[PDB]
Design a protein around this nucleic acid. Structure first.
Ligand SMILES: Nc1ncnc2c1ncn2[C@@H]1O[C@H](COS(=O)(=O)NC(=O)[C@@H](N)CO)[C@@H](O)[C@H]1O
Ligand SMILES: Nc1ncnc2c1ncn2[C@@H]1O[C@H](COS(=O)(=O)NC(=O)[C@@H](N)CO)[C@@H](O)[C@H]1O
Lengths: 452, 318
RNA sequence: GAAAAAGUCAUGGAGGCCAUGGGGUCCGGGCUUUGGGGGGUUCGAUUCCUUCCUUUUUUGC
């Protein structure tokens, strides 16, 4: 067990994470209460040890600084003086003793700092007072748009509709792409591309900046984003260490954008700078069938960096949620906006807002988009600072929203626009992209298996 | 290795043409400095007009093919070793160009090095109808490559680990004439796309493993001063079918090995290198071609209004 | 993707601070130029060993 951020700080790749433990060090009761409500990896029965280690590290650092000051002073004195002089011999002996003490105290301090940082990086972020407490069951409802479409017959599943239209293939795909795979064909791919282009244009029309991030990122970006690349119960893919070392797959475009903005200032006049990026995302994830839970899936994520004020960050998150609601209303999908609890917020999240669409074929609502606001978790981890008009650097805020997810959107559209005959209608916004008012049966003949 | 056609002309400028990287860095559309730890070496970060250019080049050819009749199909990105070996790729060796997944976490999982393998796996052990032929399917996906040429042009976008490619696969009948005509159609389609974009290119026939014929299209690059391959259409007569047991049901009903044809529609790295080095201006501007004007929205690219991102890291002179 | 060389205004020596060639300001003269980052030997390491990064040489798909 180790931490990539500490390794980078040790090797000099980046500065040491400037944690805000002191923010709550003055009132351990509030921090313990928040940790208990979040119920993260770290419990409330281990904070005192972390504080004790931090205090000991501070004292050792102070003693080391004092010793370094004395050594520098004696070295300067020797330099200004410049063998048999008793003063020279005394200074040499004092320097030897100081060096011995420094080498004796250095490993102790290094081990203490390593332990303290490895125990402190596991702490979660703050929580908004308006965020309800409890499990997923305690999800507050904020807005409900649309209604459940009325069906004159039993609605069929999304997988069944896709197999009938020959647009989504999932049978006998083990030897092709492992489990939880699919092959979008025809109208399925056309609908996916239309949705992606529509979302991209709608986002570019409101001032957003398009971007493109890689898919193979190092574990450092994930650790700074608040993830666990190397872990037994992890779900993030990892390339072969023999072929490449310290390389991981991009779980989401947000990680790529954070890596891009890592160690880079932003102009105050340019802030808030928002960037939308559409790319594929892979997740091990190790329902039993369908496109609900898949490994690889296309997605467009919006990352915004605003000023330091919480009012500005809140307004940015509100704007993102409003844009997502307008996109869903434009596409014609019945959904509900929920407020995630403290136990499901996450490590870096502070105020998460999820969106659940109505899936008649599934029989219940399903999450199809999420948005979160992190005040300083990412900035303090990746050292994402920003300068002001004067010239001082301050940690900026970061908000990450999911513009659209093709798997859940396709599931919702196929289960909502279905018909009695078997066709699926198209919304009034993607008709231009699809070139068809409705999706009829396919003209080509499906493939027949002739293998073992 | 013999050239067959040559369309277009080399641009003319009153100054020494600059490189694509220099223009991108000046306009701040791409970034490649200080990314060894973020996304490894050789990793670009497109922004501003760069992303709009990529989307334009990934939605122009796709739409053009969709208007001529094409069956779009989205393929996966995590293929198995069987599909890779069936195509003719051997990731078992150490100096391979296919990213291998950790065997401890997964078993026999390999990253998709290109969309060709993904489109080939769709027909693995599946008989296609006779009337459906010819079956053409375009697929735009991200392709990763483990090995790059570091010695030659290391600081550049020519050879990058990950890119966004758009391939065009085609399944034809058992007759070689049909496969040849389909390859000719694909070549003419890509040539028309290149001409519409306004890029000077040259098509050539490579000499002489599993592919029977390979047509390579190399675009002009004033900044580099030498042509560069931008596409390569290969024609495998029966290697893919013989390795993957791909067949088709004829009229009589007997199973036969079907001919496969694959061709690259467009590569974003090379297309943007050609566009940046060809449409160069005196003040670093970049004129948008007459086809991507509707997508980019700007008749002439200019310097960005926002301030570029500085560096506040330890690796800097203080 | 691998192996090798250099290292910050340039050349050359110098672990206790430089010679020459340089850049800018002021009256040929004068002022003035601390070396890319993180680790070890040392009383003090821009100089001895190692690592990150920038540049350069060989091999290869
Ligand atoms: N294993 C998965 N398979 C398919 N789709 C998924 C999977 N996990 C999440 N999604 C989809 O992607 C959306 C993104 O929400 S999220 O993963 O929990 N949050 C993020 O990705 C952060 N980068 C902020 O957006 C989900 O709402 C859901 O629609
Ligand atoms: N390392 C690379 N980095 C970026 N782009 C590449 C790279 N290698 C090939 N390409 C792009 O892909 C095109 C086809 O070359 S190829 O990858 O070797 N051949 C194929 O992909 C086959 N599927 C032919 O359809 C090239 O012309 C170039 O545009």
């Amino acid at each position: 067990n180790r931490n990539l951020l500490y390794e980078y700080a040790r090797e000099g790749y980046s500065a040491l994470p400037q944690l805000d433990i002191e923010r709550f060090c003055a009132c351990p009761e509030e921090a313990a209460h928040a940790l208990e409500l979040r119920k993260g990896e770290l419990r409330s029965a281990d904070l005192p040890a972390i504080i004790s280690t931090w205090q000991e590290l501070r004292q050792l650092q102070e003693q080391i600084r004092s010793l370094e000051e004395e050594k520098a002073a004696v070295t300067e004195a020797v330099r200004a003086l410049l063998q048999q002089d008793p003063k020279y011999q005394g200074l040499r002996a004092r320097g030897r003793e100081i060096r011995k003490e420094l080498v004796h105290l250095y490993p102790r301090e290094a081990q203490l700092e390593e332990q303290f940082y490895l125990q402190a990086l596991k702490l979660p972020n703050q929580t908004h007072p308006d965020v309800p407490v409890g499990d997923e069951s305690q999800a507050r409802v904020l807005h409900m748009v649309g209604d459940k479409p009325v069906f004159s017959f039993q609605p069929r599943g999304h997988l069944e509709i896709g197999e009938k239209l020959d647009i989504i293939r999932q049978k006998r795909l083990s030897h092709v792409s492992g489990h939880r795979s699919y092959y979008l064909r025809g109208a399925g791919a056309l609908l996916q591309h239309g949705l992606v282009n529509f979302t991209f244009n709608k986002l570019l029309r409101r001032g957003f900046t398009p971007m493109t991030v890689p898919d193979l990122l190092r574990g450092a970006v994930f650790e700074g984003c608040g993830m666990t690349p190397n872990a037994n119960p992890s779900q993030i893919y990892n390339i072969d260490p023999a072929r490449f070392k310290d390389l991981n797959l991009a779980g989401t475009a947000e990680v790529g954008l954070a890596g891009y903005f890592m160690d880079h200032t932003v102009a105050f006049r340019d802030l808030p700078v928002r960037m939308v990026c559409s790319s594929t995302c892979y997740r091990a994830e190790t329902e039993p069938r369908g496109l609900y839970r898949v490994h690889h899936f296309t997605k467009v994520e919006m990352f915004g960096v605003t000023g330091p004020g919480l009012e500005q960050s809140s307004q940015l998150l509100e704007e993102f949620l409003s844009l997502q609601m307008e996109i869903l209303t434009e596409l014609g999908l019945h959904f509900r906006v929920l407020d995630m609890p403290t136990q499901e917020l996450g490590l870096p999240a502070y105020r998460k807002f999820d969106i659940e669409a109505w899936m008649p074929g599934r029989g219940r609502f399903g999450e199809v988009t999420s948005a979160s606001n992190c005040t300083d978790f990412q900035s303090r981890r990746l050292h994402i600072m920003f300068q002001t008009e004067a010239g001082e650097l301050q940690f900026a805020h970061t908000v990450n929203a999911t513009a659209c997810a093709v798997p859940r959107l396709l599931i919702a559209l196929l289960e909502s626009n279905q018909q009695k005959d078997g066709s699926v209608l198209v919304p009034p916004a993607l008709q231009s992209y699809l070139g068809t008012d409705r999706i009829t049966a396919p003209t080509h003949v499906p493939l027949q298996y002739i293998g073992p | 290795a013999r050239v067959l056609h040559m369309v277009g002309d080399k641009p003319v400028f009153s100054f020494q043409p600059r490189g694509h990287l220099e223009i991108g860095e000046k306009l701040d559309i791409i970034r490649q400095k200080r990314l060894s730890h973020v996304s490894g070496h050789r990793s670009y970060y497109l922004r501003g007009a760069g992303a709009l250019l990529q989307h334009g080049l990934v939605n122009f050819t796709f739409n053009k093919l969709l208007r001529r009749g094409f069956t779009p199909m989205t393929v996966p990105d995590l293929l198995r070793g069987a599909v890779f070996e069936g195509c003719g790729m051997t990731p078992n060796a150490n100096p391979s160009q296919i990213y291998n997944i950790d065997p401890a976490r997964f078993k026999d999982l390999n990253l998709a090095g290109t969309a060709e393998v993904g489109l080939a796996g769709y027909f693995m052990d599946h008989t296609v109808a006779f009337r459906d032929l010819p079956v053409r399917m375009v697929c735009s996906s991200t392709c990763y490559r483990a090995e790059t040429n570091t010695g030659q042009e290391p600081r550049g976008l020519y050879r990058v680990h990950h890119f966004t490619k758009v391939e065009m696969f085609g399944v034809t009948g058992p007759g070689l004439e049909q496969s040849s005509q389909l390859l000719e159609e694909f070549l003419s389609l890509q040539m028309e796309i290149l001409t519409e974009l306004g890029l000077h290119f040259r098509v050539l026939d490579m000499p002489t493993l599993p592919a029977y014929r390979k047509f390579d299209i190399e675009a002009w690059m004033p900044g580099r001063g030498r042509f560069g391959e931008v596409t390569s259409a290969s024609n495998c007569t029966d290697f893919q079918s013989r390795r993957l047991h791909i067949m088709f049901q004829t009229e009589a009903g007997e199973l036969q090995f079907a001919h496969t044809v694959n061709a690259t529609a467009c590569a974003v790295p090379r297309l943007l290198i050609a566009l940046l080095e060809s449409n160069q201006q005196k003040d670093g501007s970049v004129l948008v071609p007459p086809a991507l004007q509707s997508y980019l929205g700007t008749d002439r690219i200019t310097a960005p209004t926002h301030v570029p991102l500085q560096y506040i890291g330890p690796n800097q002179p203080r």
